[PDB]
Symmetry: C3
Subunit: 151 residues, 3 copies
Protein backbone atom coordinates (compact mmCIF):
# COMPACT_ATOMS: atom_id res chain seq x y z
CA UNK A 1 0.00 0.00 0.00
CA UNK A 2 2.33 2.70 1.29
CA UNK A 3 5.01 0.00 1.43
CA UNK A 4 4.15 -1.43 -1.97
CA UNK A 5 4.53 2.10 -3.30
CA UNK A 6 7.83 3.02 -1.61
CA UNK A 7 9.60 -0.24 -2.44
CA UNK A 8 8.29 0.31 -5.95
CA UNK A 9 10.12 3.64 -5.77
CA UNK A 10 13.23 2.10 -4.22
CA UNK A 11 13.08 0.07 -7.45
CA UNK A 12 13.48 3.03 -9.81
CA UNK A 13 16.34 4.54 -7.79
CA UNK A 14 18.43 1.36 -8.02
CA UNK A 15 17.87 1.01 -11.76
CA UNK A 16 18.76 4.67 -12.25
CA UNK A 17 22.01 4.05 -10.35
CA UNK A 18 22.96 1.02 -12.43
CA UNK A 19 22.56 2.90 -15.71
CA UNK A 20 24.26 6.04 -14.38
CA UNK A 21 27.09 4.12 -12.72
CA UNK A 22 27.40 1.98 -15.85
CA UNK A 23 28.00 4.98 -18.11
CA UNK A 24 30.26 6.51 -15.47
CA UNK A 25 32.54 3.47 -15.45
CA UNK A 26 33.12 3.88 -19.19
CA UNK A 27 34.00 7.53 -18.61
CA UNK A 28 36.46 6.69 -15.82
CA UNK A 29 38.27 4.00 -17.84
CA UNK A 30 38.91 6.29 -20.82
CA UNK A 31 41.68 6.73 -21.74
CA UNK A 32 44.01 5.50 -18.99
CA UNK A 33 42.23 2.42 -17.70
CA UNK A 34 41.78 -1.18 -18.80
CA UNK A 35 39.14 -3.52 -17.47
CA UNK A 36 39.59 -7.28 -17.39
CA UNK A 37 37.52 -9.55 -15.16
CA UNK A 38 37.33 -8.23 -11.61
CA UNK A 39 40.51 -6.17 -11.88
CA UNK A 40 41.28 -2.70 -13.24
CA UNK A 41 44.55 -1.46 -14.64
CA UNK A 42 45.17 2.28 -14.59
CA UNK A 43 48.18 4.33 -15.67
CA UNK A 44 49.47 7.43 -13.88
CA UNK A 45 50.36 8.87 -17.28
CA UNK A 46 54.06 9.06 -16.43
CA UNK A 47 57.14 7.09 -15.38
CA UNK A 48 59.08 6.48 -12.16
CA UNK A 49 61.71 4.17 -10.67
CA UNK A 50 60.29 0.95 -9.20
CA UNK A 51 60.35 1.98 -5.54
CA UNK A 52 58.75 5.29 -6.52
CA UNK A 53 56.03 3.75 -8.70
CA UNK A 54 55.51 0.97 -6.16
CA UNK A 55 54.58 3.33 -3.33
CA UNK A 56 52.28 5.24 -5.67
CA UNK A 57 50.19 2.12 -6.08
CA UNK A 58 50.10 0.93 -2.46
CA UNK A 59 48.80 4.25 -1.12
CA UNK A 60 46.25 4.67 -3.91
CA UNK A 61 44.83 1.49 -2.36
CA UNK A 62 45.99 -0.92 -5.06
CA UNK A 63 49.29 -2.26 -6.36
CA UNK A 64 51.58 -2.49 -9.40
CA UNK A 65 50.10 -4.34 -12.37
CA UNK A 66 50.31 -8.10 -11.67
CA UNK A 67 48.79 -9.82 -14.74
CA UNK A 68 48.20 -13.43 -13.69
CA UNK A 69 46.71 -14.24 -17.07
CA UNK A 70 47.28 -13.98 -20.81
CA UNK A 71 43.96 -12.13 -20.79
CA UNK A 72 45.09 -9.75 -18.05
CA UNK A 73 48.43 -9.35 -19.81
CA UNK A 74 46.83 -8.58 -23.17
CA UNK A 75 44.69 -5.86 -21.57
CA UNK A 76 47.61 -4.48 -19.58
CA UNK A 77 49.52 -4.60 -22.87
CA UNK A 78 46.69 -2.54 -24.40
CA UNK A 79 47.58 0.10 -21.83
CA UNK A 80 51.33 -0.17 -22.42
CA UNK A 81 50.92 0.06 -26.20
CA UNK A 82 48.68 3.12 -25.80
CA UNK A 83 51.15 5.21 -23.79
CA UNK A 84 53.95 3.81 -25.93
CA UNK A 85 55.82 3.21 -22.68
CA UNK A 86 57.11 -0.02 -21.14
CA UNK A 87 55.76 -0.48 -17.63
CA UNK A 88 56.90 -2.02 -14.33
CA UNK A 89 55.11 -5.07 -12.96
CA UNK A 90 54.94 -5.78 -9.22
CA UNK A 91 57.29 -8.78 -9.37
CA UNK A 92 60.87 -8.92 -8.07
CA UNK A 93 63.44 -11.63 -7.32
CA UNK A 94 65.25 -9.25 -4.97
CA UNK A 95 64.80 -11.68 -2.08
CA UNK A 96 66.59 -14.51 -3.85
CA UNK A 97 68.17 -13.98 -7.25
CA UNK A 98 66.73 -16.09 -10.07
CA UNK A 99 63.28 -16.55 -8.53
CA UNK A 100 60.72 -13.78 -9.08
CA UNK A 101 57.87 -13.23 -6.61
CA UNK A 102 54.64 -11.26 -6.23
CA UNK A 103 54.71 -8.52 -3.55
CA UNK A 104 53.13 -10.83 -0.95
CA UNK A 105 56.12 -13.08 -1.49
CA UNK A 106 54.21 -15.69 -3.50
CA UNK A 107 55.43 -17.35 -6.73
CA UNK A 108 54.46 -16.61 -10.35
CA UNK A 109 51.35 -18.47 -11.49
CA UNK A 110 51.88 -16.85 -14.92
CA UNK A 111 54.69 -15.29 -16.95
CA UNK A 112 55.20 -13.90 -20.46
CA UNK A 113 58.98 -13.59 -20.76
CA UNK A 114 60.73 -12.43 -23.93
CA UNK A 115 63.36 -14.70 -25.59
CA UNK A 116 66.45 -14.80 -23.37
CA UNK A 117 64.72 -13.27 -20.34
CA UNK A 118 65.24 -13.06 -17.41
CA UNK A 119 69.00 -12.68 -17.75
CA UNK A 120 69.76 -10.47 -14.71
CA UNK A 121 71.82 -8.44 -17.20
CA UNK A 122 74.71 -6.64 -15.49
CA UNK A 123 74.26 -8.99 -12.54
CA UNK A 124 71.72 -6.46 -11.31
CA UNK A 125 68.24 -6.68 -12.82
CA UNK A 126 65.66 -7.72 -10.22
CA UNK A 127 62.52 -5.96 -11.46
CA UNK A 128 60.24 -6.49 -14.46
CA UNK A 129 58.88 -4.34 -17.27
CA UNK A 130 56.28 -5.18 -19.91
CA UNK A 131 56.88 -4.13 -23.52
CA UNK A 132 54.49 -2.73 -26.12
CA UNK A 133 54.53 -6.25 -27.59
CA UNK A 134 53.37 -7.51 -24.19
CA UNK A 135 56.47 -9.58 -23.46
CA UNK A 136 58.56 -9.40 -20.27
CA UNK A 137 62.12 -8.34 -19.49
CA UNK A 138 63.76 -8.27 -16.08
CA UNK A 139 65.36 -4.84 -15.58
CA UNK A 140 67.05 -2.70 -12.95
CA UNK A 141 64.70 -1.12 -10.41
CA UNK A 142 66.24 2.34 -10.78
CA UNK A 143 64.96 2.72 -14.34
CA UNK A 144 61.84 4.79 -14.94
CA UNK A 145 59.08 2.73 -16.56
CA UNK A 146 55.40 3.56 -17.09
CA UNK A 147 53.43 3.52 -13.82
CA UNK A 148 50.38 1.23 -14.02
CA UNK A 149 48.52 0.10 -10.89
CA UNK A 150 45.94 -2.66 -10.61
CA UNK A 151 42.72 -2.26 -8.64
CA UNK B 1 7.85 -3.83 11.03
CA UNK B 2 10.27 -6.54 9.87
CA UNK B 3 10.43 -5.87 6.13
CA UNK B 4 9.62 -2.32 7.17
CA UNK B 5 13.03 -2.29 8.84
CA UNK B 6 14.36 -4.43 6.01
CA UNK B 7 13.46 -2.02 3.21
CA UNK B 8 14.19 0.98 5.39
CA UNK B 9 17.66 -0.59 5.30
CA UNK B 10 18.16 -0.82 1.54
CA UNK B 11 16.56 2.61 1.21
CA UNK B 12 19.15 4.04 3.58
CA UNK B 13 22.00 2.38 1.71
CA UNK B 14 20.61 3.35 -1.70
CA UNK B 15 20.43 6.93 -0.44
CA UNK B 16 23.95 7.08 1.03
CA UNK B 17 25.00 5.49 -2.26
CA UNK B 18 23.41 8.21 -4.41
CA UNK B 19 25.23 10.92 -2.48
CA UNK B 20 28.58 9.19 -2.86
CA UNK B 21 28.05 8.50 -6.57
CA UNK B 22 26.97 12.12 -7.02
CA UNK B 23 30.12 13.67 -5.57
CA UNK B 24 32.25 11.21 -7.52
CA UNK B 25 30.57 12.02 -10.82
CA UNK B 26 31.65 15.68 -10.51
CA UNK B 27 35.17 14.53 -9.65
CA UNK B 28 35.70 12.48 -12.83
CA UNK B 29 34.19 15.26 -14.96
CA UNK B 30 36.97 17.50 -13.65
CA UNK B 31 38.76 18.66 -15.66
CA UNK B 32 38.44 16.61 -18.85
CA UNK B 33 34.68 16.18 -19.16
CA UNK B 34 31.37 17.97 -19.59
CA UNK B 35 27.83 16.89 -18.81
CA UNK B 36 25.06 18.21 -21.04
CA UNK B 37 21.79 16.32 -20.72
CA UNK B 38 22.35 12.58 -20.41
CA UNK B 39 25.38 12.72 -22.72
CA UNK B 40 28.92 13.04 -21.35
CA UNK B 41 31.72 14.56 -23.41
CA UNK B 42 35.26 13.57 -22.41
CA UNK B 43 38.56 14.59 -23.97
CA UNK B 44 41.65 12.39 -23.83
CA UNK B 45 43.91 15.47 -23.86
CA UNK B 46 45.99 14.75 -26.97
CA UNK B 47 45.58 14.79 -30.76
CA UNK B 48 45.31 11.89 -33.23
CA UNK B 49 44.23 11.34 -36.83
CA UNK B 50 40.51 10.69 -37.35
CA UNK B 51 40.81 6.90 -37.66
CA UNK B 52 42.92 6.41 -34.54
CA UNK B 53 40.67 8.75 -32.54
CA UNK B 54 37.52 7.02 -33.86
CA UNK B 55 38.93 3.64 -32.84
CA UNK B 56 39.77 4.96 -29.35
CA UNK B 57 36.18 5.99 -28.79
CA UNK B 58 34.53 2.88 -30.18
CA UNK B 59 36.86 0.88 -27.92
CA UNK B 60 36.11 2.83 -24.74
CA UNK B 61 32.53 1.77 -25.48
CA UNK B 62 31.58 5.13 -26.95
CA UNK B 63 32.29 7.28 -29.99
CA UNK B 64 33.55 10.66 -31.22
CA UNK B 65 31.79 13.82 -30.10
CA UNK B 66 28.56 14.27 -32.11
CA UNK B 67 26.94 17.52 -30.90
CA UNK B 68 23.25 17.35 -31.79
CA UNK B 69 22.18 20.76 -30.50
CA UNK B 70 23.22 24.22 -29.42
CA UNK B 71 23.45 23.16 -25.77
CA UNK B 72 25.58 20.13 -26.69
CA UNK B 73 27.88 22.02 -29.04
CA UNK B 74 28.38 24.63 -26.31
CA UNK B 75 29.39 21.95 -23.79
CA UNK B 76 31.84 20.45 -26.28
CA UNK B 77 33.37 23.81 -27.15
CA UNK B 78 34.19 24.17 -23.45
CA UNK B 79 36.48 21.14 -23.58
CA UNK B 80 37.98 22.54 -26.79
CA UNK B 81 38.40 26.06 -25.42
CA UNK B 82 40.07 24.58 -22.34
CA UNK B 83 42.62 22.48 -24.24
CA UNK B 84 43.12 25.19 -26.87
CA UNK B 85 42.94 22.33 -29.38
CA UNK B 86 40.43 21.95 -32.20
CA UNK B 87 38.72 18.58 -31.77
CA UNK B 88 37.37 15.97 -34.22
CA UNK B 89 33.73 14.95 -34.67
CA UNK B 90 32.29 11.59 -35.77
CA UNK B 91 30.63 13.00 -38.88
CA UNK B 92 31.89 12.20 -42.38
CA UNK B 93 30.95 12.59 -46.04
CA UNK B 94 33.36 9.82 -47.01
CA UNK B 95 30.47 7.97 -48.66
CA UNK B 96 28.56 10.67 -50.56
CA UNK B 97 30.74 13.70 -51.27
CA UNK B 98 28.95 16.62 -49.65
CA UNK B 99 26.56 14.60 -47.51
CA UNK B 100 27.77 14.50 -43.90
CA UNK B 101 26.39 11.77 -41.65
CA UNK B 102 26.88 10.27 -38.19
CA UNK B 103 28.49 6.81 -37.84
CA UNK B 104 25.02 5.26 -38.02
CA UNK B 105 24.75 6.74 -41.51
CA UNK B 106 21.98 9.19 -40.63
CA UNK B 107 22.09 12.74 -42.02
CA UNK B 108 22.88 15.67 -39.72
CA UNK B 109 20.16 17.05 -37.45
CA UNK B 110 22.19 20.00 -36.14
CA UNK B 111 25.18 21.90 -37.52
CA UNK B 112 27.36 24.89 -36.76
CA UNK B 113 29.36 25.44 -39.94
CA UNK B 114 31.84 28.29 -39.93
CA UNK B 115 31.17 30.96 -42.58
CA UNK B 116 32.10 29.41 -45.93
CA UNK B 117 32.06 25.84 -44.64
CA UNK B 118 32.37 23.20 -45.71
CA UNK B 119 34.54 23.71 -48.79
CA UNK B 120 36.20 20.29 -49.23
CA UNK B 121 39.45 22.22 -49.64
CA UNK B 122 42.22 20.70 -51.74
CA UNK B 123 39.63 18.38 -53.25
CA UNK B 124 39.44 16.19 -50.14
CA UNK B 125 38.06 16.87 -46.64
CA UNK B 126 35.72 14.17 -45.36
CA UNK B 127 35.92 14.74 -41.60
CA UNK B 128 34.82 17.49 -39.21
CA UNK B 129 36.51 19.56 -36.48
CA UNK B 130 35.11 21.88 -33.80
CA UNK B 131 37.06 25.07 -33.07
CA UNK B 132 37.51 27.03 -29.84
CA UNK B 133 34.89 29.45 -31.18
CA UNK B 134 32.40 26.62 -31.64
CA UNK B 135 32.06 26.78 -35.42
CA UNK B 136 32.79 23.86 -37.77
CA UNK B 137 35.35 23.21 -40.53
CA UNK B 138 35.81 20.09 -42.67
CA UNK B 139 39.29 18.58 -42.75
CA UNK B 140 41.41 15.80 -44.16
CA UNK B 141 41.00 12.71 -41.96
CA UNK B 142 44.79 12.54 -41.78
CA UNK B 143 45.00 15.64 -39.62
CA UNK B 144 45.79 15.15 -35.94
CA UNK B 145 42.99 16.80 -33.98
CA UNK B 146 42.06 16.79 -30.30
CA UNK B 147 40.40 13.54 -29.25
CA UNK B 148 37.08 13.89 -27.44
CA UNK B 149 34.61 11.04 -26.92
CA UNK B 150 30.92 11.02 -26.01
CA UNK B 151 29.29 8.57 -23.60
CA UNK C 1 2.88 -10.42 -0.31
CA UNK C 2 5.15 -11.10 -3.29
CA UNK C 3 7.25 -8.14 -2.12
CA UNK C 4 9.70 -10.40 -0.27
CA UNK C 5 10.47 -11.68 -3.77
CA UNK C 6 11.55 -8.18 -4.71
CA UNK C 7 13.48 -7.03 -1.65
CA UNK C 8 15.55 -10.17 -2.14
CA UNK C 9 16.25 -8.35 -5.40
CA UNK C 10 17.13 -4.79 -4.36
CA UNK C 11 19.40 -6.44 -1.78
CA UNK C 12 21.66 -8.17 -4.31
CA UNK C 13 21.91 -5.14 -6.58
CA UNK C 14 22.65 -2.65 -3.81
CA UNK C 15 25.25 -5.18 -2.69
CA UNK C 16 26.79 -5.47 -6.16
CA UNK C 17 26.55 -1.72 -6.76
CA UNK C 18 28.14 -0.74 -3.46
CA UNK C 19 31.09 -3.07 -3.96
CA UNK C 20 31.58 -2.04 -7.59
CA UNK C 21 31.50 1.67 -6.75
CA UNK C 22 33.90 1.10 -3.84
CA UNK C 23 36.58 -0.05 -6.27
CA UNK C 24 36.17 2.73 -8.81
CA UNK C 25 36.80 5.02 -5.86
CA UNK C 26 40.43 3.95 -5.57
CA UNK C 27 40.45 3.89 -9.36
CA UNK C 28 39.38 7.52 -9.83
CA UNK C 29 41.51 9.02 -7.06
CA UNK C 30 44.60 7.74 -8.88
CA UNK C 31 46.75 9.70 -9.39
CA UNK C 32 45.20 13.17 -9.10
CA UNK C 33 42.85 12.85 -6.12
CA UNK C 34 42.82 12.45 -2.34
CA UNK C 35 39.86 11.98 -0.03
CA UNK C 36 39.79 13.07 3.62
CA UNK C 37 36.61 12.67 5.62
CA UNK C 38 33.90 13.20 3.04
CA UNK C 39 35.81 15.84 1.06
CA UNK C 40 37.86 15.13 -2.07
CA UNK C 41 40.74 17.29 -3.25
CA UNK C 42 41.29 16.92 -7.01
CA UNK C 43 44.14 18.53 -8.95
CA UNK C 44 43.51 19.89 -12.46
CA UNK C 45 47.16 19.03 -13.05
CA UNK C 46 48.27 22.43 -14.31
CA UNK C 47 48.86 25.98 -13.10
CA UNK C 48 46.62 29.04 -13.56
CA UNK C 49 46.01 32.40 -11.83
CA UNK C 50 43.58 32.72 -8.91
CA UNK C 51 40.73 34.19 -10.96
CA UNK C 52 40.97 31.60 -13.74
CA UNK C 53 41.39 28.64 -11.40
CA UNK C 54 38.65 29.57 -8.93
CA UNK C 55 36.31 29.50 -11.91
CA UNK C 56 37.40 26.06 -13.11
CA UNK C 57 36.50 24.85 -9.61
CA UNK C 58 33.26 26.76 -9.19
CA UNK C 59 32.22 25.72 -12.71
CA UNK C 60 33.07 22.09 -11.90
CA UNK C 61 30.62 22.17 -8.99
CA UNK C 62 33.36 22.63 -6.40
CA UNK C 63 35.67 25.40 -5.23
CA UNK C 64 39.34 26.10 -4.56
CA UNK C 65 40.82 23.77 -1.97
CA UNK C 66 39.95 24.94 1.55
CA UNK C 67 41.80 22.79 4.12
CA UNK C 68 40.05 23.31 7.46
CA UNK C 69 41.84 20.74 9.59
CA UNK C 70 45.35 19.42 10.05
CA UNK C 71 44.05 16.24 8.43
CA UNK C 72 42.41 17.95 5.45
CA UNK C 73 45.66 19.95 5.16
CA UNK C 74 47.93 16.88 5.34
CA UNK C 75 45.83 15.28 2.61
CA UNK C 76 46.11 18.29 0.33
CA UNK C 77 49.85 18.40 1.01
CA UNK C 78 50.01 14.93 -0.52
CA UNK C 79 48.88 16.23 -3.91
CA UNK C 80 51.16 19.29 -3.87
CA UNK C 81 54.23 17.13 -3.15
CA UNK C 82 53.35 14.66 -5.93
CA UNK C 83 52.96 17.28 -8.66
CA UNK C 84 55.75 19.41 -7.17
CA UNK C 85 53.85 22.71 -7.49
CA UNK C 86 52.66 25.07 -4.75
CA UNK C 87 48.88 25.33 -5.04
CA UNK C 88 46.21 27.99 -4.56
CA UNK C 89 43.81 27.86 -1.64
CA UNK C 90 40.33 29.44 -1.82
CA UNK C 91 40.93 32.05 0.84
CA UNK C 92 41.65 35.74 0.28
CA UNK C 93 41.69 39.02 2.18
CA UNK C 94 40.74 41.21 -0.76
CA UNK C 95 37.65 42.43 1.07
CA UNK C 96 39.50 43.59 4.17
CA UNK C 97 43.30 43.61 4.16
CA UNK C 98 44.93 41.34 6.74
CA UNK C 99 41.68 39.42 7.13
CA UNK C 100 41.49 36.06 5.33
CA UNK C 101 38.14 34.51 4.47
CA UNK C 102 36.55 31.69 2.49
CA UNK C 103 34.44 32.24 -0.65
CA UNK C 104 31.63 32.44 1.91
CA UNK C 105 33.17 35.59 3.37
CA UNK C 106 33.55 33.43 6.47
CA UNK C 107 36.69 33.76 8.62
CA UNK C 108 39.28 30.98 8.95
CA UNK C 109 38.86 28.01 11.31
CA UNK C 110 42.26 26.51 10.49
CA UNK C 111 45.55 27.89 9.20
CA UNK C 112 49.08 26.56 8.67
CA UNK C 113 51.10 29.65 7.76
CA UNK C 114 54.81 29.66 7.08
CA UNK C 115 56.61 31.64 9.79
CA UNK C 116 56.08 35.38 9.35
CA UNK C 117 53.27 34.70 6.90
CA UNK C 118 51.13 36.29 5.69
CA UNK C 119 53.12 39.45 5.04
CA UNK C 120 51.33 41.04 2.06
CA UNK C 121 54.64 41.54 0.26
CA UNK C 122 54.66 44.87 -1.58
CA UNK C 123 51.16 45.37 -0.21
CA UNK C 124 49.84 43.25 -3.07
CA UNK C 125 49.48 39.69 -1.73
CA UNK C 126 45.80 38.91 -1.08
CA UNK C 127 45.83 35.21 -2.09
CA UNK C 128 46.95 31.97 -0.45
CA UNK C 129 49.07 29.12 -1.76
CA UNK C 130 50.23 25.93 -0.04
CA UNK C 131 53.82 24.67 -0.41
CA UNK C 132 55.16 21.14 -0.86
CA UNK C 133 55.76 21.16 2.90
CA UNK C 134 52.15 22.03 3.71
CA UNK C 135 52.96 25.54 4.87
CA UNK C 136 50.89 28.54 3.78
CA UNK C 137 51.97 31.80 2.14
CA UNK C 138 50.08 34.83 0.86
CA UNK C 139 50.95 35.52 -2.79
CA UNK C 140 49.99 37.70 -5.72
CA UNK C 141 46.61 36.61 -7.06
CA UNK C 142 47.92 37.20 -10.57
CA UNK C 143 50.54 34.49 -10.11
CA UNK C 144 50.06 31.01 -11.57
CA UNK C 145 50.03 28.07 -9.16
CA UNK C 146 48.72 24.49 -9.26
CA UNK C 147 44.97 24.04 -9.72
CA UNK C 148 43.29 21.91 -7.05
CA UNK C 149 39.54 21.82 -6.43
CA UNK C 150 37.71 20.55 -3.39
CA UNK C 151 34.65 18.40 -4.05
O1 LIG D 1 68.22 0.37 -20.29
C1 LIG D 1 68.67 -0.02 -21.57
C2 LIG D 1 67.90 -1.27 -21.96
O2 LIG D 1 67.56 -1.89 -20.73
C3 LIG D 1 66.59 -2.92 -20.77
O3 LIG D 1 67.04 -4.19 -21.31
C4 LIG D 1 68.41 -4.44 -21.07
C5 LIG D 1 68.51 -5.84 -20.48
O4 LIG D 1 67.56 -5.95 -19.45
C6 LIG D 1 68.20 -6.87 -21.56
O5 LIG D 1 68.35 -8.19 -21.11
C7 LIG D 1 69.12 -6.63 -22.75
C8 LIG D 1 68.85 -7.69 -23.80
O6 LIG D 1 67.47 -7.95 -23.81
O7 LIG D 1 68.86 -5.34 -23.27
C9 LIG D 1 69.22 -4.32 -22.36
O8 LIG D 1 70.59 -4.44 -22.04
C10 LIG D 1 65.34 -2.45 -21.51
O9 LIG D 1 64.74 -1.38 -20.81
C11 LIG D 1 65.68 -2.01 -22.92
O10 LIG D 1 64.50 -1.58 -23.58
C12 LIG D 1 66.70 -0.88 -22.82
O11 LIG D 1 67.13 -0.52 -24.12
O1 LIG E 1 45.74 21.77 -42.02
C1 LIG E 1 45.75 23.12 -42.42
C2 LIG E 1 44.47 23.84 -42.00
O2 LIG E 1 43.38 22.99 -42.28
C3 LIG E 1 42.08 23.43 -41.88
O3 LIG E 1 41.49 24.47 -42.65
C4 LIG E 1 41.95 24.57 -44.00
C5 LIG E 1 40.66 24.49 -44.79
O4 LIG E 1 39.89 23.47 -44.21
C6 LIG E 1 39.87 25.77 -44.60
O5 LIG E 1 38.67 25.78 -45.34
C7 LIG E 1 40.75 26.96 -44.95
C8 LIG E 1 39.96 28.26 -44.85
O6 LIG E 1 40.23 28.79 -43.58
O7 LIG E 1 41.82 26.98 -44.01
C9 LIG E 1 42.68 25.89 -44.23
O8 LIG E 1 43.05 25.97 -45.58
C10 LIG E 1 42.11 23.83 -40.41
O9 LIG E 1 42.23 22.68 -39.62
C11 LIG E 1 43.19 24.87 -40.13
O10 LIG E 1 43.21 25.23 -38.76
C12 LIG E 1 44.52 24.28 -40.53
O11 LIG E 1 45.53 25.25 -40.33
O1 LIG F 1 57.69 34.26 -7.09
C1 LIG F 1 58.53 34.70 -6.04
C2 LIG F 1 58.12 34.00 -4.75
O2 LIG F 1 56.87 34.51 -4.33
C3 LIG F 1 56.34 33.94 -3.13
O3 LIG F 1 57.06 34.28 -1.93
C4 LIG F 1 57.49 35.62 -1.97
C5 LIG F 1 56.78 36.30 -0.81
O4 LIG F 1 55.40 36.07 -0.91
C6 LIG F 1 57.31 35.69 0.48
O5 LIG F 1 56.77 36.36 1.60
C7 LIG F 1 58.83 35.77 0.51
C8 LIG F 1 59.38 35.14 1.79
O6 LIG F 1 59.14 33.76 1.74
O7 LIG F 1 59.36 35.07 -0.60
C9 LIG F 1 59.00 35.67 -1.83
O8 LIG F 1 59.48 37.00 -1.85
C10 LIG F 1 56.27 32.43 -3.27
O9 LIG F 1 55.29 32.15 -4.24
C11 LIG F 1 57.62 31.84 -3.65
O10 LIG F 1 57.56 30.44 -3.79
C12 LIG F 1 58.06 32.49 -4.95
O11 LIG F 1 59.31 31.98 -5.35
CA1 LIG G 1 70.25 -9.55 -7.78
CA1 LIG H 1 67.56 -10.70 -11.14
CA1 LIG I 1 67.03 -8.48 -18.75
CA1 LIG J 1 35.51 13.15 -50.81
CA1 LIG K 1 34.28 16.24 -48.50
CA1 LIG L 1 37.19 23.22 -44.98
CA1 LIG M 1 45.45 44.23 -0.38
CA1 LIG N 1 46.96 40.85 1.85
CA1 LIG O 1 53.83 36.33 1.50
Amino acid sequence: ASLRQQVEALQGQVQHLQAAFSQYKKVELFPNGQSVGEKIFKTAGFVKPFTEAQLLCTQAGGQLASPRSAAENAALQQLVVAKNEAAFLSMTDSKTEGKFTYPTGESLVYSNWAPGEPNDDGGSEDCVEIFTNGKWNDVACGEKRLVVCEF
